[PDB]
Amino acid sequence: AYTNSFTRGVYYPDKVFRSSVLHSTQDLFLPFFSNVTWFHAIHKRFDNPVLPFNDGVYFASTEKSNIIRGWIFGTTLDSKTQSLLIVNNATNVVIKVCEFQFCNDPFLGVYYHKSWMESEFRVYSSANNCTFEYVSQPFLMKNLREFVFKNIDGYFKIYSKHTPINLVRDLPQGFSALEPLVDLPIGINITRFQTLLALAAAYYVGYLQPRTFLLKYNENGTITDAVDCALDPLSETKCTLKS
Amino acid sequence: FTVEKGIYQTSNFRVQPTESIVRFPNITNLCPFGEVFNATRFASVYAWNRKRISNCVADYSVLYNSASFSTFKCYGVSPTKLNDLCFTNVYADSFVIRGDEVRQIAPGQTGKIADYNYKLPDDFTGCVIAWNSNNLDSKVGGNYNYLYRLFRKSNLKPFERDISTEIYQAGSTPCNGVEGFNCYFPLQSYGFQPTNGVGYQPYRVVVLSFELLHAPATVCGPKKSTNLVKNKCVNFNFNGLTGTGVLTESNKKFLPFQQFGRDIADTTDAVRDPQTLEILDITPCSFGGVSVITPGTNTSNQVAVLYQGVNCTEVPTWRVYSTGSNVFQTRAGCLIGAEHVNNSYECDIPIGAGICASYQTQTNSVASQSIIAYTMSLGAENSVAYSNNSIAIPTNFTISVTTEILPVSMTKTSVDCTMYICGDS
Amino acid sequence: SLGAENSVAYSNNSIAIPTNFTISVTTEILPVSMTKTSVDCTMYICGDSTECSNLLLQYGSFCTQLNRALTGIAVEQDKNTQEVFAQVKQIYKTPPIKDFGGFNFSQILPDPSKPSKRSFIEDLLFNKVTLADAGFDIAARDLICAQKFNGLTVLPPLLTDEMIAQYTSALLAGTITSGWTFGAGAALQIPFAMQMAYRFNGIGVTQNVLYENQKLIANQFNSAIGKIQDSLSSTASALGKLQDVVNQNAQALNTLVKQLSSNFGAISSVLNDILSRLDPPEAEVQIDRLITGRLQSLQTYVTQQLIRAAEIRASANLAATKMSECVLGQSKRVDFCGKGYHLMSFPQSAPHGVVFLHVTYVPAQEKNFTTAPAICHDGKAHFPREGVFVSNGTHWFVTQRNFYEPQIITTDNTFVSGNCDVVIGIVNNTVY
Amino acid sequence: SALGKLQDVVNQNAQALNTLVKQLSSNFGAISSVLNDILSRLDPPEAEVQIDRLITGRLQSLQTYVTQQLIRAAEIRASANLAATKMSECVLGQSKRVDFCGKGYHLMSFPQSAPHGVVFLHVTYVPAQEKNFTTAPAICHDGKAHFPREGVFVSNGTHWFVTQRNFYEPQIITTDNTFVSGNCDVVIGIVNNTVY
């Protein structure tokens, strides 16, 4: 289905500090008030497809009990070319950059009747060739997990934010900027990506576009509001007047 | 040689830094520049190997001093200054090309190599290093393992690698399968032989590219970091962010990922010390115009100086006025050499904010003239004898004649543009 | 629409004469000056860079010219304020007892209680005006900061707001205690009611009208002043002119500062970065590109400032003329000192400007009368000395033109000239 | 310093011309500031770069000078319009505008020609020796209120007169100096006194 991303997918474009100032930036942002594809898993048939990845992606989900495990980024996902395994399973967040013979159904085998443990490991066969490895982030995790991934100039920037929510069938109403998390300097090109799950699914997928935003910085840091300078004539006027 | 009475704006003044400060990350591991430049075998031109190097202390001095490099050209930087610069990361791209084609590797160049297999950006910032490797690469029997791309559908974007082996068609006719009419393989070997003269021998080429001011510094030169001091005019240098100002501990709520800070004018007004993760405020040392108050070369060589917009505590070759003994602080600035008084007269020399300067005795006694500073008086107080049923009527009159001067015109000047610019040429 | 359609009931023997009046007080705002701004051209172009300054020396005396222009602008701002406000040689003070015939100037006279001896309306105006970045004003330390720290400095005005308020208070006291005499010589005391009678004579209304409607006129003046106070307290668009001047200056300064981030074709917009990366010879090209761009920006800013200063000087000259001709006297020029027949004006100091409270006489209630140019009595034509002949339908009277006060036509209200067979429209009537 | 107003204009024009002339000595980045020296040392292809640098600099100087001159000419035109208005309204007539033709009550003005300007000698009337009198708005005579036809009622302490406002010459309050309007019950401050 589709849902409306009111003012979601806003992140700190740069690493500088700004307070009590309105800053205009151009970058890959999620346009205000746009469909973000919403995915569900039915019990049978299982819905978890391979999604495109062009000029970044916006990811959101109402993760509960940490069902969402991680994501795969690549172009073929067949061990012919490089791939990514940003995932945290039970140890710290392990990132692998190698060639993997991904299975037809890559997921953590969990039997739902207490047997909520991974049994069938069909994620991949072997790393085979492999270029670079990164294992770090020994941190765990009605709450919304917003993520922004963008692959630019050989850097895989990732932004994240945590916030409790109360809505069920739609994105929350409000504003919350996404802080940078990591800056993997890989140096590849990505066309397709896919999430991971353990045996339901509820996560939204957006797409960043090159747009100019007028970001408002508050008395004491942080982005409190933003204006999409191409959403409508009123937003264009606001961007021109810097107010 | 004679200056009329008034107040005149002269050379500004500024607080010079007491010393210089550099704060670099205390990374220890040396950069694998030798390993990069030592590589057993260099990749082909079309498959130029790119090595990412970072998180190390780069010492470009030894590379520059080494005489084994025939060509050493830097474009966005200078080799001598490379030792004092901090980069986010550095790329080392190595390959072997024709000797005469080395000049083709400069940014914004044209030629087969630059247009097909290795293109550099027009705004390339880095250093290109090349040297003959005939004896080590070329074989007596003819080393042909080096391949280059000769044909491409279109010019490749800078820093693009093309490893395709599909055959090329040079005409309108289709080229199906692996061969066809006028179908040519895009990869052609190199005829490197020891007998070949200069310009044809293999040349080991390594390209060092690095970008600046887009992320925290990870590669830094071999500069010894010094101690840190604050509340003084100092030439700071954080991760190569050279500048001058007064450092001060700040209460800014920098987020963990935030390194620099910018004001509304978009200039560095806060930095994070690379060694210790603390937020320091950045403030340029005090400055302001200097205005001299004089009663005229006519009347006295005594003068008073005004450091407008500057606190008297803070205070030009001449410094005999720093001693003071009559330093006065005004909303306009610090006034030195003028005796403040508590009277009030008509404004003689305007200083600002209702303060004026004048030359008169006022003791410092009698007949001893000096420059005084006072709050100008608007006039003599008057209380009209207003009442109901009371009127004042003049019993006389005076015929007053006053003069009023009004400019009407100015001299006509005809400036010939061509004669003025290009006189008789 | 351009306004309501109106068709004057014009006839060749019909006149409309007001039977009442309203005392109208209207406010007029005029910019008088703008913030002084001195810019160190060398610092703005080549902040703390000896090599850049040496390169700039090759351009001659552009920096000196720009500094001279800005200094002239600042001195001219001081001159504008002086010319507008320092129109009184003596600081007149109002008497402690405010026996002004029922007129109440409490809201425009100084308030001793406040630390600044400003009137209620002056305080209202000063609160209404907001600046932008900083006007270092109430600054007890260095100037604003960002703009202050790039070779741009703001010089304080020569006359403080307290001094401007003192000048305004002196002008107001002189007016309300001595009419227009203090503007021509020594202030000559006169009761305010008699002064207003003189003003009524000036607008062509007999003084008996004021002496008989004094209470009503005082009430109307007080109500108008109260309405002005309420309007200033409520609305915020009244001071649009001063706000626009301030906003224009702030926007120009912001543009000048922001231009320092432009590369102008150089590798970087940071002089320190250019100098810390390139060797002297190749760095000169980038430094020259930056110098050219920043010099062009400064020249554009200075030209804009010169034009704006000329406009502000024209406005300040107009304000000084208005002060002299409306506050120091009664003006016969139509619509100069407000709408209606001008009576008196009161000055109020405002940030970088002046506010005039023009007191005008407005006819209120107009009637229908038949009128004739002359009266035929005994074969002679009688014309009104001062006024006009009117008829209520049966009887003929002679009245002043601006107020219906019918009177018997006698030989004292009229004068004779010629006979009955020349004037067109002459009417038969007895002259007593 | 009497003619400082004209001297400032002369000085400003002279200084602007001096700056424009001095600007011809600037290199503007060229090897030399002398066109002949540049042309006599480098052949056309190289000489053109220096020539163009000088051209840019000198054109910028000329543009700055001309813009400053245009602004100054606008100011001088405003002053000249003011001078023409003053001639018309003070020399050719008598002005009732306050402080326009000098300080005081304007009587007449005489023009005098000065270099690049005009000088107006404003003759004004200034009251000199004021004296304090008691005054009333009207006079009660016979149940009627009498107002001055033109002047003001004044008292020297015992007697009441009527005088012109701007000069003291007391006169007996008669039916010719005053006019009647209404009765005594409305005017605030009315005083008994016989009207001859």
Ligand SMILES: *[C@@H]1O[C@H](CO)[C@@H](O[C@@H]2O[C@H](CO)[C@@H](O[C@@H]3O[C@H](CO)[C@@H](O)[C@H](O[C@H]4O[C@H](CO)[C@@H](O)[C@H](O)[C@@H]4O)[C@@H]3O)[C@H](O)[C@H]2NC(C)=O)[C@H](O)[C@H]1NC(C)=O
């Ligand atoms: C950016 O800057 C300011 C200051 O850095 C900051 O505002 C501060 O927020 C804290 C919140 O804890 C305030 O601390 C309060 O202090 C008062 C008086 O001492 C206490 O009574 C408060 O305790 C009560 O309220 C709390 C909720 O705030 C309750 O949790 C608690 O149980 C008590 O009931 C509290 O400790 C602090 O005073 C302000 N400081 C200022 C200058 O306002 C703010 O977070 C940031 N501003 C933004 C985002 O706009």
Ligand SMILES: *[C@@H]1O[C@H](CO)[C@@H](O[C@@H]2O[C@H](CO)[C@@H](O[C@H]3O[C@H](CO[C@H]4O[C@H](CO)[C@@H](O)[C@H](O)[C@@H]4O)[C@@H](O)[C@H](O)[C@@H]3O)[C@H](O)[C@H]2NC(C)=O)[C@H](O)[C@H]1NC(C)=O
């Ligand atoms: C236009 O103006 C005329 C003013 O002269 C009007 O004529 C006047 O109208 C009034 C009102 O009717 C009238 O007043 C009184 O008249 C009667 C007797 O008059 C005595 O008292 C008056 C006092 O003013 C005095 O002048 C007379 O000589 C006489 O002693 C009273 O009985 C009656 O109640 C009324 O109060 C005037 O007499 C009258 N004056 C003259 C000269 O006619 C006229 O009406 C008006 N026309 C229109 C269409 O409005």
Ligand SMILES: *[C@@H]1O[C@H](CO)[C@@H](O[C@@H]2O[C@H](CO)[C@@H](O[C@@H]3O[C@H](CO)[C@@H](O)[C@H](O)[C@@H]3O)[C@H](O)[C@H]2NC(C)=O)[C@H](O)[C@H]1NC(C)=O
């Ligand atoms: C009204 O004002 C005028 C002057 O403004 C007064 O008239 C006379 O003016 C002349 C010149 O200023 C003065 O002449 C005097 O002459 C006497 C006699 O020799 C001499 O003793 C004085 O020293 C002075 O030179 C003087 O101001 C005045 N004349 C006199 C006799 O006082 C006039 O007095 C004023 N009062 C009026 C007209 O009521």
Ligand SMILES: *[C@@H]1O[C@H](CO)[C@@H](O[C@@H]2O[C@H](CO)[C@@H](O[C@@H]3O[C@H](CO)[C@@H](O)[C@H](O)[C@@H]3O)[C@H](O)[C@H]2NC(C)=O)[C@H](O)[C@H]1NC(C)=O
């Ligand atoms: C000329 O115009 C003025 C007003 O501009 C007239 O005065 C006004 O007259 C009316 C009726 O006499 C007054 O209304 C009254 O108000 C009181 C409250 O104070 C109320 O209790 C009464 O029931 C009545 O409504 C009005 O207040 C008064 N305004 C002022 C400022 O005095 C005047 O009557 C007019 N003159 C002529 C000859 O028409």
Ligand SMILES: *[C@@H]1O[C@H](CO)[C@@H](O[C@@H]2O[C@H](CO)[C@@H](O[C@@H]3O[C@H](CO)[C@@H](O)[C@H](O)[C@@H]3O)[C@H](O)[C@H]2NC(C)=O)[C@H](O)[C@H]1NC(C)=O
């Ligand atoms: C001249 O105008 C001012 C402003 O209208 C007059 O002062 C004001 O007088 C009124 C009535 O006294 C005040 O309203 C109310 O006063 C009573 C006093 O017990 C109380 O209900 C409230 O305090 C309320 O304010 C008004 O506040 C007051 N305003 C000021 C600034 O004083 C003044 O009386 C007039 N001057 C003369 C001589 O009449």
Ligand SMILES: *[C@@H]1O[C@H](CO)[C@@H](O[C@@H]2O[C@H](CO)[C@@H](O[C@@H]3O[C@H](CO)[C@@H](O)[C@H](O)[C@@H]3O)[C@H](O)[C@H]2NC(C)=O)[C@H](O)[C@H]1NC(C)=O
């Ligand atoms: C020029 O500099 C002096 C000194 O800074 C200013 O006088 C005032 O001096 C005190 C101490 O030197 C400064 O801080 C003080 O802190 C104590 C608490 O420890 C506090 O009680 C004092 O009231 C004061 O704030 C103070 O910053 C400083 N005031 C200013 C405006 O700088 C002097 O006022 C300065 N004058 C100008 C025109 O800047």
Ligand SMILES: *[C@@H]1O[C@H](CO)[C@@H](O[C@@H]2O[C@H](CO)[C@@H](O[C@@H]3O[C@H](CO)[C@@H](O)[C@H](O)[C@@H]3O)[C@H](O)[C@H]2NC(C)=O)[C@H](O)[C@H]1NC(C)=O
């Ligand atoms: C009163 O103004 C009227 C106009 O409305 C004038 O009307 C008539 O003017 C003539 C001249 O008096 C008179 O009528 C004609 O004149 C002779 C005498 O000159 C008269 O006797 C004849 O009957 C002839 O028609 C007539 O008296 C007069 N109408 C009146 C008085 O009602 C007149 O000029 C003015 N009244 C005069 C002149 O007495």
Ligand SMILES: *[C@@H]1O[C@H](CO)[C@@H](O[C@@H]2O[C@H](CO)[C@@H](O[C@@H]3O[C@H](CO)[C@@H](O)[C@H](O)[C@@H]3O)[C@H](O)[C@H]2NC(C)=O)[C@H](O)[C@H]1NC(C)=O
């Ligand atoms: C206010 O002005 C009036 C009018 O001048 C003064 O009353 C007048 O005083 C003079 C005194 O010189 C009287 O004239 C002369 O009086 C003497 C003394 O009897 C006499 O011998 C002369 O022949 C001549 O008449 C004048 O008659 C008198 N006028 C009136 C209407 O009483 C009054 O003194 C002045 N008051 C003050 C305080 O100045």
Ligand SMILES: *[C@@H]1O[C@H](CO)[C@@H](O[C@@H]2O[C@H](CO)[C@@H](O[C@@H]3O[C@H](CO)[C@@H](O)[C@H](O)[C@@H]3O)[C@H](O)[C@H]2NC(C)=O)[C@H](O)[C@H]1NC(C)=O
């Ligand atoms: C201007 O002239 C009038 C006419 O005299 C003066 O008004 C009158 O003054 C007398 C005395 O104050 C009043 O007499 C009083 O009569 C009442 C009874 O109505 C009685 O109780 C008192 O004891 C006293 O005798 C008189 O009524 C009054 N009005 C008239 C028509 O005579 C007026 O005072 C004079 N103006 C000045 C400032 O004196």
Ligand SMILES: *[C@@H]1O[C@H](CO)[C@@H](O[C@@H]2O[C@H](CO)[C@@H](O)[C@H](O)[C@H]2NC(C)=O)[C@H](O)[C@H]1NC(C)=O
């Ligand atoms: C190749 O390897 C050596 C060692 O890693 C680099 O440095 C040489 O080390 C040997 C033994 O210490 C010395 O005899 C040489 O004089 C060194 N050569 C130079 C240029 O320093 C050497 O730099 C490497 N050659 C490259 C990277 O091109």
Ligand SMILES: *[C@@H]1O[C@H](CO)[C@@H](O[C@@H]2O[C@H](CO)[C@@H](O)[C@H](O)[C@H]2NC(C)=O)[C@H](O)[C@H]1NC(C)=O
């Ligand atoms: C004034 O009296 C009458 C009243 O009817 C006039 O006709 C009116 O004149 C005035 C115009 O100022 C207003 O009362 C109305 O606007 C007119 N009637 C209209 C427009 O329909 C008349 O002109 C004048 N003199 C008289 C009647 O004697």
Ligand SMILES: *[C@@H]1O[C@H](CO)[C@@H](O[C@@H]2O[C@H](CO)[C@@H](O)[C@H](O)[C@H]2NC(C)=O)[C@H](O)[C@H]1NC(C)=O
């Ligand atoms: C105003 O106009 C009217 C007519 O429009 C004039 O009164 C007329 O005058 C003529 C000539 O005396 C008579 O024939 C008419 O009988 C009059 N009434 C009409 C034509 O309606 C009147 O004289 C004019 N008054 C003025 C000052 O021009």
Ligand SMILES: *[C@@H]1O[C@H](CO)[C@@H](O[C@@H]2O[C@H](CO)[C@@H](O)[C@H](O)[C@H]2NC(C)=O)[C@H](O)[C@H]1NC(C)=O
């Ligand atoms: C003019 O000023 C005098 C004195 O200040 C006023 O005299 C007062 O008059 C009223 C009655 O009208 C009395 O209640 C007061 O006692 C008087 N005061 C004094 C000191 O005598 C007078 O009211 C004012 N107004 C006029 C028209 O004269």
Ligand SMILES: *[C@@H]1O[C@H](CO[C@@H]2O[C@@H](C)[C@@H](O)[C@@H](O)[C@@H]2O)[C@@H](O)[C@H](O)[C@H]1NC(C)=O
């Ligand atoms: C002028 O008025 C004088 C007194 O009026 C005033 O009295 C005190 C309250 C002060 O304000 C003082 O300055 C005023 O003059 C009287 O002497 C006299 O009536 C008048 N004097 C003259 C020469 O006319």
Ligand SMILES: *[C@@H]1O[C@H](CO)[C@@H](O)[C@H](O)[C@H]1NC(C)=O
């Ligand atoms: C989501 O897509 C639909 C079109 O199917 C349309 O409503 C719009 O493009 C998006 N919805 C909203 C509320 O913006």
Ligand SMILES: *[C@@H]1O[C@H](CO)[C@@H](O)[C@H](O)[C@H]1NC(C)=O
């Ligand atoms: C991008 O990925 C696709 C498929 O993996 C590949 O064909 C293409 O060569 C890649 N582009 C670059 C510049 O490597």
